[PDB]
Design a protein around this ligand. Structure first.
Ligand SMILES: *[C@@H]1O[C@H](CO)[C@@H](O[C@@H]2O[C@H](CO)[C@@H](O)[C@H](O)[C@H]2NC(C)=O)[C@H](O)[C@H]1NC(C)=O
Ligand SMILES: *[C@@H]1O[C@H](CO)[C@@H](O[C@@H]2O[C@H](CO)[C@@H](O)[C@H](O)[C@H]2NC(C)=O)[C@H](O)[C@H]1NC(C)=O
Ligand SMILES: CCCCCC/C=C\CCCCCCCC(=O)O
Ligand SMILES: *[C@@H]1O[C@H](CO)[C@@H](O)[C@H](O)[C@H]1NC(C)=O
Lengths: 55, 55
């Protein structure tokens, strides 16, 4: 079930899903990701970040 | 005797009011399980030893 306190969903190109920082499931390596989302209770702005690993 | 998310031990498990926004379970510096989160409602439970050192 969806817990009431999800605040970030991170998807890696190798198929790993992180919810709130913890890897809960891994699929096969992903080539492309289609999404279509909308929300109204996310204050004023919510962000989608494309990120690369760094130390 | 608990087996929680693969970590096993002997202890007393209690429900806390604390709100930790990240992670599934927490360990000490020695690697002992200290707390874990219920994935349905987000409640955090603490784990304590059944017996302690005395003088
Ligand atoms: C997600 O919701 C939380 C609240 O549940 C938002 O954080 C609050 O933002 C308001 C508006 O700036 C502040 O007054 C509160 O103090 C914040 N609560 C905190 C920090 O606990 C948060 O902005 C929302 N996130 C998104 C992306 O919309
Ligand atoms: C995690 O939390 C859920 C939600 O509170 C717990 O499921 C509840 O269990 C009680 C006792 O059987 C039922 O009365 C409730 O109706 C359940 N709520 C649900 C299903 O939403 C669940 O037991 C908790 N998990 C653990 C391991 O304690
Ligand atoms: C892609 C839509 C959302 C994915 C749904 C996944 C299903 C269950 C969520 C399990 C992770 C729960 C983490 C607890 C988060 C928290 O309460 O802080
Ligand atoms: C924790 O929750 C219980 C039950 O609501 C309450 O009686 C207790 O005072 C709370 N403890 C703290 C430190 O808030």
């Amino acid at each position: 079930t969806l817990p009431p306190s999800v605040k970030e969903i991170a998807i890696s190109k190798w198929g790993h899903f992180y919810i709130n920082g913890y890897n809960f499931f891994s699929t096969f390596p992903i080539d492309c990701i289609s999404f279509n989302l909308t929300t109204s209770t996310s204050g004023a702005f919510w962000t989608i970040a494309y990120t690369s690993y760094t130390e | 005797d608990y087996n929680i998310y693969g970590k096993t031990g002997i202890g007393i498990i209690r429900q806390t009011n604390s709100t930790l926004l990240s992670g599934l379970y927490y360990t000490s510096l020695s690697g002992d399980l200290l707390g874990f989160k219920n994935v349905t409602d987000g409640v955090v439970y603490s784990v304590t030893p059944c017996d302690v050192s005395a003088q």
